[PDB]
Ligand binder design. Structure first.
Ligand SMILES: NC(=O)c1ccc[n+]([C@@H]2O[C@H](COP(=O)([O-])OP(=O)(O)OC[C@H]3O[C@@H](n4cnc5c(N)ncnc54)[C@H](O)[C@@H]3O)[C@@H](O)[C@H]2O)c1
Ligand SMILES: NC(=O)c1ccc[n+]([C@@H]2O[C@H](COP(=O)([O-])OP(=O)(O)OC[C@H]3O[C@@H](n4cnc5c(N)ncnc54)[C@H](O)[C@@H]3O)[C@@H](O)[C@H]2O)c1
Ligand SMILES: NC(=O)c1ccc[n+]([C@@H]2O[C@H](COP(=O)([O-])OP(=O)(O)OC[C@H]3O[C@@H](n4cnc5c(N)ncnc54)[C@H](O)[C@@H]3O)[C@@H](O)[C@H]2O)c1
Ligand SMILES: NC(=O)c1ccc[n+]([C@@H]2O[C@H](COP(=O)([O-])OP(=O)(O)OC[C@H]3O[C@@H](n4cnc5c(N)ncnc54)[C@H](O)[C@@H]3O)[C@@H](O)[C@H]2O)c1
Ligand SMILES: [Zn+2]
Ligand SMILES: [Zn+2]
Ligand SMILES: [Zn+2]
Ligand SMILES: [Zn+2]
Lengths: 347, 346, 346, 347
């Protein structure tokens, strides 16, 4: 089968011909009908998340098929599979754990000590087929097509979790940094659907802000032409933002936004652009500010976002559908900040 | 009345004689019997918390009587005061708000936009009497004496809230930095009394660690004669600490402990030594760690620590007492890191 | 000034002429522009909530002006009032506490031991003016008019708190009983605005269900012409409802819905029709279901619903307005179940 | 192997000779060194929990080996078992789920739609060996012996969860009904270890109250000689109890304690004596009281209580150790309210 794999860092993904997995036990073989392209793949290709080398520090073993936004039809199931039949259209939660470690026992499976992340350390969706370790990570689709559902397995579940960590309510204001991109449009839609908080979207491209508005942002700020700090201060009437979901965490964003937080404000750090957070400690203490890391999501988060989308409350903004072989072009678009919403590959 | 006030930044507190406040409405006048000495007064005297100037930046108007750990007896009450009488022994919650702003409405009074902090921007306990804006901030003392209860109004409520933010449970390990001081000894007693988590106390003086051990720490580590990272990793079997309550937040502590956090670990920042937190962002994201600021406490926190104390489940470790006029010496001891537990003035 | 007061239990509210309150300190005098009519006033007039007598049991002292959904303009302020001026349009939180008791300290003012409930044990909005104990209970109106905001101070805050207690999320289903009334229409709008859960509205009148559908219900069920159990089970695919907000709690509703709860399901009891909950204990234990009482709301709840409303995300459905003197007729409509949405007096 | 099984309701458990299970895959065969006796087995033997027949209504299929308080040594592991070796002394969490249903996905495994409860609908610990479905339900013991740990898997995890649902803090008072029994002594120790709340123990036997005190109760009330209502009112100075953990839920207890709740008080219903809760609805609404059901516990709860005990913070009060063949006598003792603390069988 065809597969776009990461064979060497700093080099484009290579199309290869590898065997189709054979499911056994509780595993499930899925024929891919949609594979979303995540900016995280830009970092993977470069082989690094900030100062962290995926191979040397994170333990990734090359080669590996990328693609962690997965949706397709069940092709074959193992002998222990129950409640799923061949032909079923499903979305797949790639953030899988083994079950015995501390993090799996408390329901934080994505933080497993021996993680099975499809598309990162295990073969992902940039292929004609993908082997899913356990059927419990599936979610049958009815209202959504594979193309519309795929982005939900990463950008969706990730921002759903981040939005929960933001602890929103009607009296609070949320600021999303990078609001026109893949996770940005998803975070905005979700915040608009599961809370009554005021949503402010921030980006640097005119097209990105149009995307943020289509996503439902109550207010948008172009940080290239406008003074983001002044605008956020004005909109919140001098109070500052009660929560900020930073989908960049770059030298640029971390030098600006951590300073527009209201007292008790929560700065949820999702982006992986790579930079150090330098912040005066007394500022953290005296203002009870919080810097919170958020990574993908657990089974509850996956269930939550899938339920919301399947109910028609939110829907990924897929702006382009391309071939599996165009994987390197889709990733380039993100690397060059030329895409809005989400791009999805179809084998 | 006698009163030790911050009259000039950088200079010792000055013994001054000012009018005795006259309570009206729901206000209450307390005759001070005990005033705890907090390290915060070292910063105050120096005129800053890190880069933040108390006057220009934090808006403190001098002169002001310091002292934010308050306990004494009611001397006089306003005409609207209910449920309290002259002579009543009480502890005072100094972190007061006005009630109308966003923060007061959600029950986070200490973060009021127009704060009324006794001992900070309003006159405190380093005097014969102290005026209390509302009787709602009082707590009748029964089991504890004024001297034993005074520290609860700051070191107690501050660490009670911090322990709460640490989200502890029996399977977690908590590390307390500065475990032998005023807040350190309280943080440990509270953590042991309101959770079943493993407690590791870290300090840099043999006696401080002994005070930490007595407070109830399961393990103690002297960072100045042994590598804390190795011990903490060993104790947690390589997992790291699920929570750290840093009562320093100095360049020294922030360069060590943030790196010993377990995944989802919470770094609660209470200390105000002054330094910049510096941490690689990808590490915060990939490990889902949290850096959380915690400041004094609200009325719920005050009630929690006073009830816990009056029930005899925790008790401030007062290692020495002295006169009001000796305020400058007590503060020097903290500045020179010469004390263990809490000092109280009378 | 004119005022409709509960002078005699069992008898209509009486038009009376009493002195106009004079505000002092932090008190504020509001000139009433809108007073919502709540079903609670049906109980009040009848003199009881279930078996609980408002006088003997609940301690209500007659006579008292009713009306707990308040909105109007500031007429006069006490000398200590800050941030408000004469002429300011505001909504009033009537569920007020004194601040010193356990409940006020933990931020649950509405459960104060010495409650100051405007329209219940203190004079309410069914009059030309109403005295407000503290300006902290006010909320400046910008987007909404007095008539549109009045209902938020009871039907809004009550259901906002109830929606919160329901612990909803996208994978859950909420069932609202009495979905076409004052609280019902609000509960649905709020549930839709602050969660992504599936909402099922149940009522017994075609128009009530239409009002429920308009409020935003995903499904509507007329319990008087179809079996609600079958529909709810079908809609939830046999799982049952994860939460039910019962705005009746009558022998009729309690004999049906508690049995349609999913495991861990939460039955939030708001309605005060009067009945006894009767459920086999082993079922509560084995299914981990919860029967939760919810009463009006605290300052945090008030802030939440007022902000949500002023942002235009929800809005009380006022289907009719009338004169203060018509108070007894508006209450009759609710008693006879003749209204949909909310009625407001001017 | 020997096994004490429930073969017919209303009749004593029968000693039988059944084959020793053969573990495969992720299963683990444990040689039982301790099996605690739970009052729940009194209800099982009678074949009913209140109005609920275990067979006709709950779906239990007879015969079945009882015993849900399990501890022993690993005898054999399946091929997929990792991190566990033969000879390891472990406690076993019997409240197991399948993983795919809603409740398993959100971390509430014990409420699984297709539960695997060892000792209830699957063979339990009243035997020489027990087959554990998955090694992730194990917890290695170091400080505790099997006899001291066994009770933790039901009375321990159940009361740990109930204590959490009670939402305690230093200013609150907890009242435990049935404080001298198995779950009673465990609830008291736990509340004393994980909260600073005031603990009041209530029972009807002098011996039961001695047990409650040894457990650490701050106050004890003998409901046979004293007026429980008056005492609770006096101790809480007229406020009432902020939380009540009822380990009976009988006609007797439900007619008394739901009426001594403080405003916002939580009545956590754990006991299964069988009775209907009849309570005036306006009382629930106007006082914001809560009636909360609590059943065993999930993997997080199990991890929590095991950590606490393994740390020496709490320890089951085993008052008697007897032979496997004495299973019917141990259960009779509970049925007749003649035992304090917990009884443990050793094959
Ligand atoms: N923590 C997690 O679980 C997780 C999961 C997925 C992706 N991510 C990370 O989130 C980040 C964004 O991912 P994405 O897929 O949405 O990519 P994306 O390219 O679609 O979005 C990036 C957006 O950032 C905007 N941007 C660039 N510089 C900016 C600035 N200075 N201020 C404001 N906006 C700016 C761009 O215009 C663009 O719209 C990446 O680093 C990715 O690896 C994290
Ligand atoms: N955020 C708040 O609400 C709040 C409230 C009160 C006090 N504080 C602050 O907390 C800090 C401590 O206050 P305190 O009253 O307990 O004072 P303290 O004098 O008791 O000092 C705390 C302890 O820190 C120890 N220490 C010093 N260097 C150390 C190192 N490198 N590693 C480990 N331990 C070290 C000292 O030996 C001492 O025992 C101060 O900065 C104070 O201003 C904050
Ligand atoms: N706990 C609190 O804080 C609080 C606050 C305000 C009002 N309330 C109470 O809530 C209840 C409802 O108040 P409301 O103002 O919305 O009044 P309402 O007149 O609008 O009545 C509510 C709805 O119940 C419907 N109904 C009647 N019988 C029904 C049945 N068998 N099944 C389904 N629906 C049925 C009616 O048709 C009506 O639409 C009252 O008992 C009131 O006193 C409680
Ligand atoms: N929900 C769950 O997860 C769960 C789990 C295990 C056991 N249980 C149930 O909890 C209950 C108790 O179990 P146990 O194992 O501790 O049994 P136990 O016999 O050891 O305890 C019962 C105690 O109740 C006391 N008691 C009897 N009548 C009383 C009264 N009127 N007032 C106060 N105390 C009274 C007895 O003196 C005795 O000490 C049973 O119904 C059992 O099935 C529930
Ligand atoms: Zn794991
Ligand atoms: Zn304020
Ligand atoms: Zn009160
Ligand atoms: Zn399941």
């Amino acid at each position: 089968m065809r597969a776009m794999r990461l064979v060497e860092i700093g080099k484009p993904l290579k199309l290869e011909d590898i065997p189709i997995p054979k499911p056994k036990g509780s595993q499930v073989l899925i024929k891919i009908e949609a594979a979303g392209v995540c900016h995280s793949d830009v970092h993977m290709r470069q082989g690094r998340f900030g100062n962290l080398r995926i191979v040397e520090d994170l333990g990734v073993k090359l080669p590996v098929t990328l693609g962690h936004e997965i949706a397709g039809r069940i092709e074959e199931v193992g002998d222990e599979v129950v409640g799923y039949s061949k032909g079923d259209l499903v979305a797949v939660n790639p953030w899988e754990g083994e079950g015995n470690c501390y993090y799996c026992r408390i329901g934080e499976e994505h933080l497993c000590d021996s993680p099975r992340w499809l598309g990162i350390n295990y073969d992902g969706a940039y292929a004609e087929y993908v082997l899913v370790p356990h059927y419990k990570y599936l979610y049958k689709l009815r209202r959504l097509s594979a193309v519309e559902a795929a982005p939900l397995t990463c950008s969706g579940v990730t921002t759903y979790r981040a939005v929960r960590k933001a602890s929103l309510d009607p009296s609070k204001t949320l600021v999303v940094i990078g609001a026109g991109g893949g996770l940005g449009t998803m975070a905005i839609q979700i915040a608009k659907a599961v809370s009554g908080a005021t949503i402010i979207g921030v980006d640097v491209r005119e097209e990105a802000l149009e995307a943020a508005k289509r996503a439902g942002a109550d207010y948008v700020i172009n940080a290239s032409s406008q003074d983001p700090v002044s605008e956020i201060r004005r909109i919140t009437q001098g109070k500052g933002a009660d929560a900020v979901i930073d989908l960049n965490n770059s030298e640029k964003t971390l030098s600006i936004y951590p300073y527009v937080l209201a007292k008790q404000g929560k700065y949820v750090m999702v982006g992986l652009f790579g930079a150090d957070l330098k912040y005066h400690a007394p500022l953290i203490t005296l203002n009870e500010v919080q810097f919170i890391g958020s990574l993908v999501g657990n089974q509850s988060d996956f269930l939550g976002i899938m339920s919301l989308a399947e109910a028609g409350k939110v829907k990924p903004m897929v702006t382009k559908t391309m071939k599996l072989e165009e994987a390197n072009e889709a990733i380039d678009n993100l690397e060059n900040f030329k895409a809005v919403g989400r791009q999805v590959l179809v084998p």
